[PDB]
Amino acid sequence: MVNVTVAYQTSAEPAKVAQADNTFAKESGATVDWRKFDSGASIVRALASGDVQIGNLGSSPLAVAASQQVPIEVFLLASKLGNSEALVVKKTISKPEDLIGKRIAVPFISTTHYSLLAALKHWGIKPGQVEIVNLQPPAIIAAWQRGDIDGAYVWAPAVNALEKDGKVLTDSEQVGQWGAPTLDVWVVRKDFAEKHPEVVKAFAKSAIDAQQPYIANPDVWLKQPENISKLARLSGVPEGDVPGLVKGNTYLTPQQQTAELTGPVNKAIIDTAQFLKEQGKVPAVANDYSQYVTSRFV
């Protein structure tokens, strides 16, 4: 009997159908404790302490973890992040320079913290000119409802809660085009990968398999009602928001997973770590992160 704790996050993406279906548990034979985390920083800490063995990390928490030499490896990609996450601001904030003096929330060292700093740099705004406050997404929603913040760079469900009365100022598809793309990945502790490699392979298989029908034909996948309801439930968004969220990322074929895990992801960590160091968020970085990536489970 194998027990495994999987840290998941509130993305509405096609592999959530496998989570809802319990496919990984059924195919691996393991007892799977799916634990929801509000953002990636707390997942890194749980990975490091051993409380979580498989976790969904954004590329920015990944880079932080790898620079701290946490013994984890990316073993597949969840998605390439696009306008599924966005900077949403009070409607009176109409142009980037209106952000100066305003109070903008992000979860600390998340992909949207990283994307905010990259967007500010692109706009020629020093980060200190904005009151960047660190809040978890549920607290961001509550702070927005009470008018205590002027905006936030967030993912689902907070991005959809805020956009209902706010304005999108930029998004992570644009920030990627500017030269600061972000990724969503799955990582595994070394000791778990050593003891239970077939369980790790089963996890990767269940996620990759679940995304392929969407990749093959997004519109056909999105009109299957059970695909939409499973994503709405696990992410916490209304069903009407799911299609735009799903189409706000791109996903990988098995061939693309192997290709990405053999070079591109390493380069992504190198570059993400470097920008985080320039923004003063990590003290030291490396010129190579090949220890933190593997294709052997796909």
From Swiss-Prot:
Cellular compartments per GO CC: ATP-binding cassette (ABC) transporter complex, substrate-binding subunit-containing; membrane; outer membrane-bounded periplasmic space
Keyword Isomerase: no
GO biological process entries: cellular response to sulfate starvation; cellular response to sulfur starvation; taurine transmembrane transport
Gene3D superfamilies referenced in this protein's UniProt entry, alphabetically: Periplasmic binding protein-like II (3.40.190.10)
InterPro entries reported in the protein's UniProt record: ABC_Gly_betaine_transp_sub-bd, Peri-bd_TauA, Solute-binding_3/MltF_N
UniProt GO MF annotations: transmembrane transporter activity
Protein location: Periplasm
Superkingdom of the source species: Bacteria
Induction: Repressed by sulfate or cysteine.
Keywords on record: Periplasm, Signal, Transport
Pfam entry (one): OpuAC
Family designation: Belongs to the bacterial solute-binding protein SsuA/TauA family.
The protein's role, per its UniProt record: Part of a binding-protein-dependent transport system for taurine.
Name of this chain's protein: Taurine-binding periplasmic protein
